[PDB]
Subunit: 332 residues, 4 copies
């Protein structure tokens, strides 16, 4: 594999069509799914030359701990759909690569088992029927050693996935929600913040004032995201709001972005627009489907090479330097 696109082709060959569609699809007409890619393709980096690259490092510190790259594995539900080892294979490869792994509320292996793999597990929360149940899930994650609560804030309910409807897609009987919903509000965020010492990261912020309010609410970070184009069809890509959001928060929390990251060059674009780090979703599942744990390992080593390559070619010895790069919008 020399690009992430090699992995998509491999995953399409192996997966049943309806499972590939569950993974690949978005809501509605898939306008936001496509726009995530269009937006990145419009961004061009203005690289710097002739800087000291004797000690190029892709490492960052985030939520109190080092990560080997400015990247984490995005929460993706039901990973046993893609490979029999599911979440354990992905978490093992992420741990070995020094990349945080986001455990899902809807994981097909229990959060305690995934956390036992080690590494830097984060936990993604969906708000449950009642506050007590929701906070018990947060407590389980904390007790198991998860290092951040990634509270998904863009799913009052799941969006309308037309591929799944047309396929009549249902979970196989051999895939379950191994950890076992009502719309979250700012009051829910406060309940979580008051119930944990872990950083709370709000995933799915797109409006500038919601980013500001996230800081005021005590969030340790946000993920600027349209949920991979799976929620509101027509929601702006996170990458298009990122610069405005970074300016408005003015360092008050970590600002991550996701949606359509498909190369180290895309990571560089995200950092040049101001992101602290990115999440990567579908490509990790392509690698899992294609070759299990070893596939994910190969994907992460390819991304690490691409990130180092892009940073050095752009004159950046550190991720902080990459955040100071300028960009110019073009046409594609």
């Amino acid at each position: 594999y020399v690009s992430l696109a090699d992995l998509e082709r491999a995953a399409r060959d192996v997966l049943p069509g309806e499972i590939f569609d569950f993974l690949a699809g978005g809501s509605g007409t898939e306008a936001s799914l496509v726009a995530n890619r269009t937006a990145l393709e419009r961004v061009f980096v203005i690289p710097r030359m002739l800087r000291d690259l004797t000690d190029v490092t892709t490492e960052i510190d985030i939520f109190g701990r080092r990560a080997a790259l400015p990247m984490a594995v995005a929460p993706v539900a039901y990973q046993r759909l893609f490979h029999p080892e599911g979440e354990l294979a992905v978490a093992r490869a992420a741990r070995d690569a020094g990349v945080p792994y986001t455990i899902c509320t809807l994981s097909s292996v229990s959060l305690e088992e995934i956390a036992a793999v080690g590494g830097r597990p984060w936990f993604q929360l969906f708000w449950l029927r009642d506050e007590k149940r929701s906070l018990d899930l947060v407590r389980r994650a904390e007790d198991a050693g998860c290092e951040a609560i990634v509270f998904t804030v863009d799913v009052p309910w799941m969006g309308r996935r037309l591929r799944d409807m047309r396929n009549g897609f249902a979970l196989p009987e051999w895939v379950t929600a191994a950890n076992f919903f009502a719309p979250a509000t700012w009051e829910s965020v406060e309940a979580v913040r008051a119930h944990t010492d872990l950083p709370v990261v709000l995933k799915g912020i797109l409006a500038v004032e919601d980013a500001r309010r996230a800081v005021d609410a005590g969030a340790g970070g946000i993920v600027v995201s349209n949920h991979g184009g799976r929620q509101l069809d027509g929601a702006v890509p996170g990458i298009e709001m990122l610069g405005e959001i970074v300016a408005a928060v003015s360092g008050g929390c970590e600002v991550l972005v996701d949606g359509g990251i498909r190369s180290g060059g895309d990571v560089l674009k995200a950092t040049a627009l101001g992101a602290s780090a990115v999440l990567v979703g579908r490509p990790v599942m392509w690698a899992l489907a294609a070759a299990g744990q070893d596939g994910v390992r190969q994907l992460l080593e390819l991304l690490a090479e691409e990130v180092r390559d892009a940073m050095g070619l752009a004159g950046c010895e550190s991720v902080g330097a990459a955040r100071r790069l300028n960009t110019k919008l073009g046409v594609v």
Copy 2:
């Protein structure tokens, strides 16, 4: 049916080619027909998160009465072209869905029969040979219980529909103007306003100063519209003038928009740009052609689901909240 596009495919299968062309076509090169879709596809919504959605409602008040959605059925002439029950089937489904139905001057069933269906009938007016005849038609509509006069202001004459010319399209002998023209002016608007207590709504406004003059003329509303790309080929899409027009009228009348609305997400875009409500034309006729009254019912229930879905995903418990959403233009 999981999208409005399912209905177009069904209607193309059943309708004779020349009738499908009468419905689908625009004037000239169809530049304005295509631009109605292009314009909507360029708009992206910036959704809000974490708001109270316990009582999400898609209802609005317009022209003194509640509507179940921020939408009405646009005036489309000669509905018996598409199904034997024609206007009665559409009006029955609209009534049952709580959506206003616009009766045409060129309806293939008399306006009194359509009004007798019940619901919230509006009446669309074309200006006739002389003021007296025009005002008699307005009086008939009022006597029959129509709740608004939708005065079409963009048809001094009908545009040049090249599909119809190439097809030699003519009305079948079994379709007639069951209610049975000169260019309307501002004097005609005043004659109507002085002759009825019903709200007068000017359909086909695109220039900002025409919207302002509409308010000054006593209009209760306007429809910002290029007539579905059927009138001036090269006329700007209504959606592209909507924001400027909403600012200029500053609440002095209701501001509706039409042209290319094909999903609840498109309704959300229109409201985020400032519209009070939208009209929907061709998709209603697709549903009528595909399955008569039940087809229209299914279309309206699908649109209701899509509107509720889009509003909630965007953090809007009411249409008023949706009007306060921000947007960002993208590339497609």
Copy 3:
């Protein structure tokens, strides 16, 4: 024929490939040829409603005389290439339609014969080897009753027409320059202006300061034009400079435009951007090739219908009103 595109298809059927290529082609990569069309397709008109259309007229006064439309036939060389009657057929149809006809310096019938047809002949000048010969040609045109000198200013030499090179295209022996070159300068313009009482119109102006200098030089008009994309490959379309040029000349001369006018809607766009009138080139030759004089007659009657249709739909009872229309750029 219901559109000008019908005529292109007819002309392609009848003409030898190398002659069609001589007519259709541009210089270099044909970037400016294509851009003439792209530019018009990006312009949208903001029509006005409810205005008095009792006496809609497409007539204008230009260079002292009435024209039936805001249009003239552009100078196109060697019209016998397209039909045996060549320039006489086109001039007869133009006369009958009330449209000025531009006689070429490189006409395949003598300018005196074409002028004898009557109508409103203009004469297009290429600067010749020496001032004396050039001025004799101007004097011939004036003596024959031509009403304006259209001095082509964008041909210091002919551009590089790759279709013609690849075809090895040469004039047939039966086509000659029946009136029988050095680069023109501002001194040449002054020599012409001092030698005739006819209005001098500079064809091929694109730079704002060249338009201003044209007024200062005593020109009665300019044609904002990239020569149909046949001269500098990469020259901006005239339609894209028109608004800036109209503002800079501030009524000091007539401002015409050409390049890619293919419908009455395109004429409306040009006038809304500020043009006094347009020239039309290739479509007139398509009509000539397809059906001789009667073909040109049909083209001009179609254009007249389209211009009247577009003006009325846009609320314009006169061309002056159309010049006051606003426009909005879109995407295509």
Copy 4:
């Protein structure tokens, strides 16, 4: 050959696929390779008319010597890959055309042999393992009569060429680096500047502040360049930074540009945006592959004709006049 594209077609026919791919390819997804062309295609020139063209000249003075065109042959490694005579054939044709030729550090014929051809040889430098070796290479070039040191500053290491990886491309045993690396810094630039009296030209500058720093560092010129899209995938095209860079340097050094120059019209665009001269890479190799020295001669004579044609059509008797042309961005 009537366009540079004729030469690409000829080269694709003759070269082995993997060698054509080495020449044609870029890094990553080839976004920057494509953008070099997209950017030029968006630029339109505003030509001037009626200027004195009695003595049109395409000559410039650069680095102390006359050149026949505002163009030089870009450094392209291993020219024996494309033709048995390799660099000698290209240098001979460049000399005969009056165009400077850039000798590569990775040339397949020694720099002394290429310099012995005569003409105006420049020397492109890659920074070597240590300062002493690097400066010895500079000294060799100076001793051999090279007239400028083109220090490549955008290659801390070579980019990731996916075509080469997928082809498993390797140099044939019959091609070697006949002159026989560590990342260059500003200290390396200073070491070169202090070690030679020749002008030092920094190739691969894209950031405005790097252009300013180049002037402050004593560079005699810069090449605004993304290395033909072969280095950072996603780097902005040089043509898009050129105007801003020309303004910032305010005549303090020569400002060249490269990337996607494919015609004399493209040369005109580059000069109108402010470039002193362009480099041309791939097309020179197409000509070499197609027909050796005579092929390169034909390419350079075609480019000379196209440059003269474009300049005159735009009203420019000199390259300085072309730099004063204005431009307008369009859509393609």
